[PDB]
Subunit: 96 residues, 5 copies
Amino acid sequence: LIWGCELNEQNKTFEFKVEEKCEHQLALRTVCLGDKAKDEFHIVEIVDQEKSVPIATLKPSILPMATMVGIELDPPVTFRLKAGSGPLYISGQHVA
Amino acid sequence: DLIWGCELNEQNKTFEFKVHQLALRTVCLGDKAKDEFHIVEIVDKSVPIATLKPSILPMATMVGIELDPPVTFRLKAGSGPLYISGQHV
Amino acid sequence: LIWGCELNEQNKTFEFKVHQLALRTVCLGDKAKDEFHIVEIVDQKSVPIATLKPSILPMATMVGIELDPPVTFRLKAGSGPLYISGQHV
Amino acid sequence: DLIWGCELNEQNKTFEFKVCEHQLALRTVCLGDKAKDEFHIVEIVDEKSVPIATLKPSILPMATMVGIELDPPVTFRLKAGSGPLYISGQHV
Amino acid sequence: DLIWGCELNEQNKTFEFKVEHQLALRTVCLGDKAKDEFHIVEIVDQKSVPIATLKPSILPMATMVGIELDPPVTFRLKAGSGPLYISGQHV
């Protein structure tokens, strides 16, 4: 199944988790802005312990999405909107 | 192994791919699309997967996205033409 | 190994003529007019695969598009020169 | 498995990555939101420097790196620009 | 395996990768002083095949995926002044 989250200013941080192990990874597929996103740089980072790794920088009028290739993560994973108001959408898939 | 494609627009905001797996390859705008952000998502949960705008980014390459039918593509925003392309796999 | 064509305003078509073609990139030449070019794959019908435009996106990387002969490439919109590259797989 | 990243910027232009064996697979390069609006170039140093990415905030603020798998130690340097420029990768 | 690259420019429009082992291309990118014009790079099968078009204020680099090449190959700057840089790995 396809997975998605939305990061935005009210909800800057989203923790993806899990009812089974199983060992399934989350493979990122794309990151993309909503069409009422403010016209400013939006930066999405992966958080783990404190270290975060920026992985995408976007801006509506410059670069509104990015294709993610090869990123496979071990749950639990935390995504965070380091900069920007969003909506910023992340998509992915379950992988074995 | 052989090419598939759909078209979404204002009067056709949806396309069900029904009855193997679909590998997406590209999403791109037609040349008369209006100059606005277009968002296409997968519903089966709604998950956006591309945001495009003719004078900013008129296409994207999709990598790794392989889907089991049935899946519906929706144009969450924008009026199209927006084309999705892919391959049976 | 390496292969490519050139579609343009005279030559809108190129037929890849009968194992397997892996597209690599599609890119515009430096004198394409500044307009939307669209390239579709035609079958034995039609699936737009790249939208480009010199001052917006003048090339794209193709990933995962592997084709069985025959297949034809059409310059649906635009003057060209537009170049496709590929590799026999 | 675990995600890796580094920040190259004007103060710290060079970042040396050091570790049963394990390559570093790069995933993305991207600019910070206060980077100056100028071209940033990043290169791998081994002395021969090979540039791998050029970015600029108002033109192309990030890129996806595909297939670049490196054997430690690797050195990243900011050939141009002041950053922040962020690199992400995975142990593989 | 190991990192390879070359600089192509107006004075040196060609670079020949010379001789088992293929070259997997990774990126192409422009220098911060390239002029603001379309640069094109093609593989010369010595049919030259363009593989990239870039321009500093529109698109200053691109990611190559799946291009693996047997030497001898030659890369040619079909337009543009450069510096244009190409990167790759021996696979």
